[PDB]
Amino acid sequence: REIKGYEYQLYVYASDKLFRADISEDYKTRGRKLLRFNGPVPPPGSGGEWEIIDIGPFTQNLGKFAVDEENKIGQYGRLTFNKVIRPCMKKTIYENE
Protein backbone atom coordinates (compact mmCIF):
# COMPACT_ATOMS: atom_id res chain seq x y z
CA ARG A 1 0.00 0.00 0.00
CA GLU A 2 1.11 3.60 0.57
CA ILE A 3 4.64 3.87 1.99
CA LYS A 4 5.16 5.95 5.11
CA GLY A 5 8.91 5.44 5.47
CA TYR A 6 11.78 3.09 6.17
CA GLU A 7 13.87 1.94 9.09
CA TYR A 8 17.47 0.77 8.79
CA GLN A 9 19.51 -1.26 11.31
CA LEU A 10 23.28 -0.90 10.95
CA TYR A 11 26.50 -2.28 12.38
CA VAL A 12 28.93 0.63 12.01
CA TYR A 13 32.61 0.91 12.87
CA ALA A 14 33.55 4.34 14.18
CA SER A 15 36.93 5.11 15.76
CA ASP A 16 37.68 1.39 15.30
CA LYS A 17 34.86 0.32 17.62
CA LEU A 18 31.66 -1.41 16.55
CA PHE A 19 28.25 0.18 17.22
CA ARG A 20 24.61 -0.59 16.50
CA ALA A 21 22.70 2.27 14.87
CA ASP A 22 19.04 2.56 13.82
CA ILE A 23 17.86 5.22 11.38
CA SER A 24 14.37 6.29 10.30
CA GLU A 25 13.77 7.77 6.86
CA ASP A 26 10.48 9.39 5.92
CA TYR A 27 9.26 8.46 2.46
CA LYS A 28 7.77 11.76 1.31
CA THR A 29 10.24 14.20 2.85
CA ARG A 30 13.27 11.85 2.84
CA GLY A 31 14.01 13.24 6.31
CA ARG A 32 16.27 11.06 8.43
CA LYS A 33 16.58 10.63 12.17
CA LEU A 34 19.04 8.70 14.32
CA LEU A 35 16.97 6.48 16.61
CA ARG A 36 19.72 4.46 18.31
CA PHE A 37 23.52 4.44 18.50
CA ASN A 38 24.96 2.17 21.18
CA GLY A 39 28.06 0.16 21.88
CA PRO A 40 30.60 -1.03 21.63
CA VAL A 41 28.71 -4.20 20.61
CA PRO A 42 29.86 -7.72 19.75
CA PRO A 43 30.27 -8.45 16.03
CA PRO A 44 27.30 -10.06 14.30
CA GLY A 45 27.04 -13.83 14.04
CA SER A 46 26.48 -14.69 17.72
CA GLY A 47 22.83 -13.67 18.12
CA GLY A 48 19.88 -16.02 18.17
CA GLU A 49 16.58 -15.35 16.47
CA TRP A 50 14.17 -12.61 17.45
CA GLU A 51 11.24 -14.27 19.22
CA ILE A 52 7.93 -12.72 20.21
CA ILE A 53 7.29 -13.11 23.95
CA ASP A 54 4.24 -12.51 26.11
CA ILE A 55 3.26 -9.13 27.58
CA GLY A 56 2.92 -10.26 31.18
CA PRO A 57 4.41 -8.71 34.31
CA PHE A 58 8.06 -9.14 33.30
CA THR A 59 7.42 -7.39 30.00
CA GLN A 60 5.38 -4.61 31.63
CA ASN A 61 8.30 -4.01 34.00
CA LEU A 62 10.63 -3.64 31.01
CA GLY A 63 8.30 -0.86 29.84
CA LYS A 64 8.48 0.85 33.22
CA PHE A 65 12.28 0.65 33.06
CA ALA A 66 12.26 2.18 29.59
CA VAL A 67 10.03 5.08 30.69
CA ASP A 68 12.03 5.69 33.87
CA GLU A 69 15.25 5.81 31.85
CA GLU A 70 13.76 8.04 29.16
CA ASN A 71 12.55 10.41 31.88
CA LYS A 72 16.18 10.77 33.00
CA ILE A 73 17.07 11.86 29.45
CA GLY A 74 14.13 14.23 29.00
CA GLN A 75 13.81 14.18 25.21
CA TYR A 76 10.02 13.77 25.51
CA GLY A 77 9.43 15.64 28.77
CA ARG A 78 8.06 13.85 31.82
CA LEU A 79 6.26 10.70 30.64
CA THR A 80 3.81 8.49 32.53
CA PHE A 81 4.11 4.77 31.81
CA ASN A 82 0.84 3.21 30.63
CA LYS A 83 1.54 -0.28 29.26
CA VAL A 84 3.57 -2.41 26.87
CA ILE A 85 1.56 -3.76 23.93
CA ARG A 86 2.11 -6.64 21.55
CA PRO A 87 4.39 -7.53 19.90
CA CYS A 88 7.34 -7.68 22.33
CA MET A 89 10.52 -9.21 20.87
CA LYS A 90 13.45 -10.86 22.66
CA LYS A 91 16.82 -11.99 21.30
CA THR A 92 19.59 -13.90 23.06
CA ILE A 93 23.16 -12.77 22.42
CA TYR A 94 25.76 -15.50 22.90
CA GLU A 95 29.41 -15.25 23.77
CA ASN A 96 31.88 -16.45 21.16
CA GLU A 97 32.34 -20.22 21.18
Next chain:
Amino acid sequence: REIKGYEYQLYVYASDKLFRADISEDYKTRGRKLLRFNGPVPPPGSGGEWEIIDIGPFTQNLGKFAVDEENKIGQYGRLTFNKVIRPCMKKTIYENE
Protein backbone atom coordinates in the same frame (compact mmCIF):
# COMPACT_ATOMS: atom_id res chain seq x y z
CA ARG B 1 26.53 -21.84 23.91
CA GLU B 2 27.38 -19.38 26.70
CA ILE B 3 24.87 -16.53 27.00
CA LYS B 4 26.18 -12.98 27.00
CA GLY B 5 22.84 -11.18 27.35
CA TYR B 6 19.50 -10.30 25.84
CA GLU B 7 17.94 -7.53 23.82
CA TYR B 8 14.26 -6.59 23.98
CA GLN B 9 12.23 -4.52 21.49
CA LEU B 10 9.10 -2.92 22.93
CA TYR B 11 6.09 -0.90 21.86
CA VAL B 12 5.27 1.15 24.97
CA TYR B 13 2.48 3.63 25.63
CA ALA B 14 3.59 6.52 27.82
CA SER B 15 1.47 9.64 28.39
CA ASP B 16 -0.99 8.07 25.93
CA LYS B 17 1.51 8.15 23.06
CA LEU B 18 3.16 5.11 21.49
CA PHE B 19 6.96 4.73 21.49
CA ARG B 20 9.52 2.17 20.37
CA ALA B 21 12.05 1.21 23.05
CA ASP B 22 15.02 -1.18 22.94
CA ILE B 23 16.64 -2.53 26.11
CA SER B 24 19.82 -4.53 26.67
CA GLU B 25 20.14 -6.88 29.62
CA ASP B 26 23.44 -8.47 30.59
CA TYR B 27 23.17 -12.13 31.51
CA LYS B 28 25.66 -12.33 34.37
CA THR B 29 25.08 -8.97 36.04
CA ARG B 30 21.42 -8.56 34.97
CA GLY B 31 22.31 -4.93 34.29
CA ARG B 32 19.92 -3.14 31.95
CA LYS B 33 20.42 -0.24 29.57
CA LEU B 34 17.98 1.77 27.47
CA LEU B 35 19.30 1.68 23.90
CA ARG B 36 16.46 3.44 22.06
CA PHE B 37 13.28 5.34 22.90
CA ASN B 38 11.68 7.15 19.97
CA GLY B 39 8.30 8.29 18.79
CA PRO B 40 5.52 8.76 18.64
CA VAL B 41 5.42 5.77 16.26
CA PRO B 42 2.60 4.16 14.28
CA PRO B 43 0.97 1.13 15.92
CA PRO B 44 2.32 -2.27 14.88
CA GLY B 45 0.73 -4.16 12.00
CA SER B 46 1.75 -1.90 9.10
CA GLY B 47 5.43 -2.84 8.74
CA GLY B 48 6.87 -5.13 6.12
CA GLU B 49 9.55 -7.70 6.78
CA TRP B 50 13.11 -6.90 7.75
CA GLU B 51 15.29 -7.55 4.70
CA ILE B 52 19.07 -7.65 4.51
CA ILE B 53 20.39 -5.18 1.93
CA ASP B 54 23.81 -4.64 0.39
CA ILE B 55 26.57 -2.53 1.96
CA GLY B 56 27.26 -0.34 -1.05
CA PRO B 57 27.50 3.45 -1.23
CA PHE B 58 23.94 4.16 -0.06
CA THR B 59 24.45 2.01 3.02
CA GLN B 60 27.87 3.51 3.75
CA ASN B 61 26.28 6.96 3.63
CA LEU B 62 23.70 5.84 6.20
CA GLY B 63 26.66 5.01 8.45
CA LYS B 64 28.16 8.46 7.92
CA PHE B 65 24.79 10.00 8.82
CA ALA B 66 24.63 7.90 11.98
CA VAL B 67 28.14 8.95 13.07
CA ASP B 68 27.53 12.62 12.25
CA GLU B 69 24.34 12.57 14.31
CA GLU B 70 25.95 10.70 17.20
CA ASN B 71 28.75 13.27 17.21
CA LYS B 72 26.12 15.96 17.78
CA ILE B 73 24.96 14.04 20.87
CA GLY B 74 28.44 13.33 22.24
CA GLN B 75 27.72 10.19 24.26
CA TYR B 76 30.83 8.51 22.81
CA GLY B 77 33.02 11.57 22.28
CA ARG B 78 34.14 12.59 18.79
CA LEU B 79 33.92 9.53 16.54
CA THR B 80 35.47 8.95 13.11
CA PHE B 81 33.32 6.97 10.68
CA ASN B 82 35.08 3.90 9.29
CA LYS B 83 32.54 1.69 7.52
CA VAL B 84 29.22 -0.14 7.71
CA ILE B 85 29.56 -3.93 7.81
CA ARG B 86 27.16 -6.75 7.04
CA PRO B 87 24.39 -7.36 7.86
CA CYS B 88 22.43 -4.17 7.12
CA MET B 89 18.66 -4.48 7.55
CA LYS B 90 15.86 -2.42 6.00
CA LYS B 91 12.12 -2.40 6.73
CA THR B 92 9.34 -0.55 4.94
CA ILE B 93 6.66 1.06 7.10
CA TYR B 94 3.31 1.50 5.35
CA GLU B 95 0.54 3.96 5.98
CA ASN B 96 -2.77 2.55 7.15
CA GLU B 97 -4.89 1.20 4.30
